[PDB]
Amino acid sequence: SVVGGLGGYMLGSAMSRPMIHFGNDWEDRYYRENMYRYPNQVYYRPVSQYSNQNNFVHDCVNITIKQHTVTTTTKGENFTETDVKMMERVVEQMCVTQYQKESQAYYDGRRSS
Numbered sequence: 001s002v003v004g005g006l007g008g009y010m011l012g013s014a015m016s017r018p019m020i021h022f023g024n025d026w027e028d029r030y031y032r033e034n035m036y037r038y039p040n041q042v043y044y045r046p047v048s049q050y051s052n053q054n055n056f057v058h059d060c061v062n063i064t065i066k067q068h069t070v071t072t073t074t075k076g077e078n079f080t081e082t083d084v085k086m087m088e089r090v091v092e093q094m095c096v097t098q099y100q101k102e103s104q105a106y107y108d109g110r111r112s113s
Contacts, residue, residue: 005071006043009063010102014040018093020086031086037079038087042095043067047106057095064091 003011017035021028044060065087068077079087104113 005067006063009043009045011043012041012094012098015094015097018090020089020093022089027086030082034083034086035090037077037083038090039064039068042091042098044095044098044102047099047103053096053099053103056099057092060095060098061088061091064095 001008003009017038017040020031022031042060043063044056045063047056050056050059065084068087069084073079
């Protein structure tokens, strides 16, 4: 299964974008401009071999950014470490929450959810 070019991951739903302002006086305004460039969603693996939360998040901050750092970057996207970092933050935030949900779609079978 491949939701375009994943290869064998899930691809999440798209949601609002966190306002990431970093405590800086350029990184807020910088991100506020360029934020539309980022994937509005994240890639991931099933939590059914993870049990932690943060392990999953590293493993999906990996795949999401990796994909965009190879995939979009070959298709005439091109970003800096500075942008790749704003992506890093965004993906971290969105992925923790994707985890909380897919967790509630992994262990949930013992409840009604």
